[PDB]
């Protein structure tokens, strides 16, 4: 309406919602489909679920490599959305028990899962980079609000999925048997709708062309830089003032600078997988903690598992609260939150959330059940962790964009998602080790988060901003 926000983002945000919703609709039923339709092991079902999740987390590499080196965005997004839709077609087509059995179902399900992972890893970074690219580089104030609304749409899709998916798998009769075809068809239709709404804004988007084989040039420049300093028995100036400064006999400065910026941001992100792994220990351990506290609430019996819903919901209350109020208040005075202090204070908030969880666990273990904790008293730690997530993830998206060279805007987003992926891998590997008391586990997680925050703050103090 004459503002600084292009109408085109209206198509992007509405797309991402329709995507996340669909994704969270398909993932939720996934395990059950393995167990009660394909009749797989608990081991096999869990392994396939985790492998699918890891592939979804790691395909952003392929997505960004395509987008920033070839076809640009809006053609990586379009084609990978088509791949996503084909994967959904196979998934739903492989869940109707009328054709084949135990051989066609398995193959179709696995192929659909692979295609879904490929599509997700390549609709994730490219869509965010595209929406950011819709804004002029001078409009960094509106781009932050756009990223806040992007995260808000993601979380709203997650919440609506958690609230609507059981309605689709409850007492349905696809073919003399539970209706898993609908549980995947509805996400498939939502993905198709997301693709349609995205493609309907084609005439409005601000498609910037790719700048060449960015990935190949970056790899070649780094390899030449690391090979040229090898002046073992001789040499006087292998590479001075940086490890990229004498990789300049080729690769003009306009590429050396971009490689430098990418390297700086990657070094900054180095410890983020640890933070993601530590923060992810709140959808499982906190459910176990909630299992040991009263959940009547006096009004409605609240199952511990339902407490998970409090993560997205609180975010929907903090994203507008922060971006519109708290941050504004921080800007009322001289205080300068530089998008890297926001992330550090978010890490600190997560550390405090796990410290509060440890204190609550100690209080639970202090029973002797007159002093039985309600399902409340889990509210403070959820509030703290959700505030940490809001102040970290949105700021990290904006930081990955604003600090990315124009030629590799969707590669820094891929690096962000890959920190998330490595955090997931760390979670997977550490899940097999459990020999500590729950209160000691929470204390250890809080201490580890404090150490991670300290390391990240020290590294971000010496970070050289792109400019």
């Amino acid at each position: 309406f004459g503002s600084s926000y292009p109408v085109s983002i209206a198509f992007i945000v509405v797309n991402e919602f329709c995507e996340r919703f669909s994704y969270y609709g398909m993932k939720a039923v996934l395990t059950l489909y393995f167990l009660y339709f394909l009749h797989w092991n608990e081991d096999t079902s869990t392994s396939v679920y985790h492998a699918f999740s890891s592939l979804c987390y790691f395909t952003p590499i392929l997505g960004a490599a395509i987008a920033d080196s070839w076809l640009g965005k809006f053609k990586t997004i379009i084609y990978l959305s088509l791949v996503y839709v084909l994967g959904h077609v196979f998934k739903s087509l492989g869940a109707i028990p009328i054709l084949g059995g135990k051989m066609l179902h398995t193959i179709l399900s696995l192929v659909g899962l692979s295609l879904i992972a490929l599509g997700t890893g390549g609709i994730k970074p490219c869509v965010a980079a595209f929406g950011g690219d819709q804004f002029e580089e001078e409009h960094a104030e509106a781009r932050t609000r756009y990223f806040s609304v992007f995260y808000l749409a993601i979380n709203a899709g997650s919440l609506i999925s958690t609230f609507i998916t059981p309605m689709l798998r409850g007492d349905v009769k696809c073919f003399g048997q539970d209706c898993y075809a609908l549980a995947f068809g509805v996400p498939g239709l939502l993905m198709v709708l997301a693709l349609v709404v995205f493609a309907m804004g084609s005439k409005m988007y601000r498609k910037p062309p790719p700048e060449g084989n960015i990935v190949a040039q970056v790899i070649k420049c780094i390899w030449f830089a690391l090979c040229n300093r090898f002046r073992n028995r001789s040499g006087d100036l292998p590479k001075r003032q940086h490890w990229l400064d004498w990789a300049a006999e080729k690769y003009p400065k306009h590429l050396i600078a971009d490689v430098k910026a990418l390297t700086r941001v990657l070094f900054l992100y180095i410890p983020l997988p640890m933070f993601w792994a530590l923060l992810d220990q709140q959808g499982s351990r906190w459910t176990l903690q909630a299992n040991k506290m009263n959940g009547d609430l006096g009004f409605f019996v609240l199952q511990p598992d339902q407490m998970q819903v409090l993560n997205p919901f609180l975010v929907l209350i903090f994203i507008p609260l922060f971006d519109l109020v708290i941050y504004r208040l921080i800007s009322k005075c001289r205080i300068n939150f530089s998008s890297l202090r926001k992330m550090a204070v978010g890490m600190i908030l997560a550390c405090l959330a796990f410290a509060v969880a440890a204190l609550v666990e100690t209080k639970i273990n202090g029973m002797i059940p007159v002093n039985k904790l309600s399902i409340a008293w889990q509210l403070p730690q959820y509030v703290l962790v959700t505030a940490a997530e809001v102040m970290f993830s949105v700021t990290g998206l904006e930081f990955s964009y604003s600090q990315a060279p124009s030629s590799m805007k969707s590669v820094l987003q891929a690096a962000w998602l890959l920190t998330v992926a490595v955090g997931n891998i760390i979670v997977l590997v550490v899940a097999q080790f459990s020999g500590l008391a729950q209160w000691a586990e929470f204390v250890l997680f809080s201490c580890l988060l404090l150490v991670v925050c300290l390391i990240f703050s020290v590294m971000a103090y010496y970070y050289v901003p792109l400019k």
Partner: nanobody
């Protein structure tokens, strides 16, 4: 390994509780399931319980209703049938399968490698 099943006769419309005792190796490393072989029939899947007990499945019949559940300590797994009808007058086998990655259907005989002895639960 070396699963032993113990049941007995019951009356129509009553509830019976079969027991499967596994001895020799840990009971937290085995996916377990129940099968029945009515005289003249091949074998019918009855119920399944995973190694951890979290995942439990029952055949379409599961006459009236069933409830399978294991106790990894002492290796006792039991099946709780409630509304037994003149059918299901069959020997109930106990099948034990180790933990492993596989695409075999958990509700089939091919999936399970260790079979116990039957128990004639007539009605």
């Amino acid at each position: 390994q070396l699963v032993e099943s113990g049941g007995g006769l019951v009356q129509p419309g009553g509830s019976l509780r079969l027991l499967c005792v596994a001895s020799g190796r840990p009971f937290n490393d085995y996916d377990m399931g129940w099968f029945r072989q009515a005289p003249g029939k091949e074998r019918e899947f009855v119920a399944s319980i995973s190694w951890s007990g979290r995942v439990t499945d029952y055949s379409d019949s599961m006459k009236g209703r069933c409830t399978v559940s294991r106790d990894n300590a002492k290796g006792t797994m039991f099946l709780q049938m409630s509304n037994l009808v003149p059918r299901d007058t069959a020997v109930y086998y106990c099948a034990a399968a180790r933990r492993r990655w596989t695409f075999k259907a958990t509700n089939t005989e091919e999936f399970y490698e260790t079979w116990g002895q039957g128990t004639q639960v007539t009605v």
